[PDB]
Amino acid sequence: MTEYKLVVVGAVGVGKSALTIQLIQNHFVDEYDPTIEDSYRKQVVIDGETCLLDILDTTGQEEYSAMRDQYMRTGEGFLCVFAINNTKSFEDIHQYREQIKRVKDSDDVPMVLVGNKCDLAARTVESRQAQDLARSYGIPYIETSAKTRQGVEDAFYTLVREIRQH
Amino acid sequence: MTEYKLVVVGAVGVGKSALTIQLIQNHFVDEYDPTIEDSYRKQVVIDGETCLLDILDTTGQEEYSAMRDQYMRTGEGFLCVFAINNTKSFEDIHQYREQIKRVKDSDDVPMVLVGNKCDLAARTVESRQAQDLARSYGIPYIETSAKTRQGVEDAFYTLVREIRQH
Ligand SMILES: Nc1nc2c(ncn2[C@@H]2O[C@H](COP(=O)(O)OP(=O)(O)OP(=O)(O)O)[C@@H](O)[C@H]2O)c(=O)[nH]1
Ligand SMILES: Nc1nc2c(ncn2[C@@H]2O[C@H](COP(=O)(O)OP(=O)(O)OP(=O)(O)O)[C@@H](O)[C@H]2O)c(=O)[nH]1
Ligand SMILES: [Mg+2]
Numbered sequence: 001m002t003e004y005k006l007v008v009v010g011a012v013g014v015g016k017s018a019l020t021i022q023l024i025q026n027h028f029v030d031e032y033d034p035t036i037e038d039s040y041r042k043q044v045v046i047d048g049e050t051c052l053l054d055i056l057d058t059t060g061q062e063e064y065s066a067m068r069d070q071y072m073r074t075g076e077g078f079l080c081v082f083a084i085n086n087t088k089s090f091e092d093i094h095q096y097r098e099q100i101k102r103v104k105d106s107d108d109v110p111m112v113l114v115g116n117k118c119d120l121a122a123r124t125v126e127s128r129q130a131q132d133l134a135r136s137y138g139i140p141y142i143e144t145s146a147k148t149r150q151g152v153e154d155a156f157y158t159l160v161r162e163i164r165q166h
Numbered sequence: 167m168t169e170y171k172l173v174v175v176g177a178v179g180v181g182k183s184a185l186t187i188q189l190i191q192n193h194f195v196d197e198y199d200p201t202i203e204d205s206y207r208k209q210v211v212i213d214g215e216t217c218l219l220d221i222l223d224t225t226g227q228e229e230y231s232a233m234r235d236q237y238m239r240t241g242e243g244f245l246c247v248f249a250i251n252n253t254k255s256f257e258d259i260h261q262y263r264e265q266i267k268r269v270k271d272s273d274d275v276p277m278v279l280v281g282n283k284c285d286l287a288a289r290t291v292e293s294r295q296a297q298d299l300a301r302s303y304g305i306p307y308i309e310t311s312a313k314t315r316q317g318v319e320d321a322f323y324t325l326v327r328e329i330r331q332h
């Protein structure tokens with residue numbers, strides 16, 4: 001079986017666990033409850049091919065210092081998430097792309113910038129500046145919603161395909 | 167207003183007009199009725215940006231000989247469609263990628279291979295061989311359905327994004 005090892009990285013509050021749960025469980029997590037490490041494995045079919053999504057929902061702050069590195073070495077593909085109503089969350093996307101290139105010892109890794117929570121209207125991070133960071137890295141930018149599920153299968157699949165053409 | 171000039175090319179029978187109508191009208195066209203040229207213009211929002219899809223649904227055989235060339239010069243991005251139950255339709259995708267590179271005078275054009283009609287189970291063109299043609303061209307491969315609408319916004323958006331990062 002073909003498989004893909006997706007790590008979902010980025011800051012606290014953003015909606016890392018509410019996207020992974022929307023995709024693997026089809027319901028929204030309104031409940032506040034933070035993460036250390038979490039593997040979801042689903043058998044899926046993407047463009048008629050049988051694959052196993054082996055996702056590792058993690059975090060963005062703790063005593064996960066460069067203890068972050070162990071998971072980054074082995075993740076084939078990364079989802080980088082920011083929240084569109086959180087200026088700081090967008091600015092720390094650098095800090096994560098720099099050590100995903102440090103532990104991967106390559107400038108080209110399959111990734112996706114994800115401007116999450118896109119149904120709230122207190123946007124602070126324009127689409128224009130997140131679509132400009134994303135083509136500065138040579139990467140996609142997809143906008144998603146975990147309350148709504150719009151954007152979720154788009155994000156996750158765009159990434160899987162990026163892992164296919166590496 | 168940002169806009170994108172999408173040409174939908176490929177053979178007869180494949181479902182070029184049933185994808186363009188599914189996206190711009192949300193219903194399936196079961197009815198048999200062939201094409202010469204057709205512009206659909208919709209105002210859409212893709213990853214929070216306002217854009218105009220200015221699609222030009224066309225064909226794959228007629229007295230559209232290299233009269234095909236006039237539209238290919240001006241289309242910013244191409245959807246190449248084959249039907250998964252039609253071996254020949256897949257094999258003429260070459261004939262279309264060669265003159266989209268001839269009139270565009272470039273080897274890199276934003277494109278998408280589209281294995282349409284994916285809900286029928288008389289597949290003849292495996293996913294494995296269409297995912298291998300697609301990474302041979304350095305392009306996406308998305309599988310779609312116009313009876314179902316699965317794959318339709320994925321195909322069209324993946325292409326728009328490909329036009330953004332050129
Ligand atoms: N409205 C809105 N809220 C969201 C969205 N996704 C998540 N949230 C909310 O944002 C908060 C945090 O969600 P989580 O999914 O727990 O985010 P997280 O990034 O995993 O945070 P940690 O695992 O602690 O690092 C929760 O209160 C969710 O209900 C979204 O798309 N829109
Ligand atoms: N089951 C199935 N049939 C499809 C699909 N999309 C289109 N068809 C059928 O395939 C036939 C042709 O559809 P059109 O959408 O007219 O295809 P076309 O490529 O535009 O053909 P021309 O414009 O003549 O070149 C019709 O009989 C549709 O009902 C699909 O996803 N699945
Ligand atoms: Mg979490």
Ligand SMILES: [Mg+2]
Nearest residue numbers: 182183200201
């Ligand atoms: Mg037609």
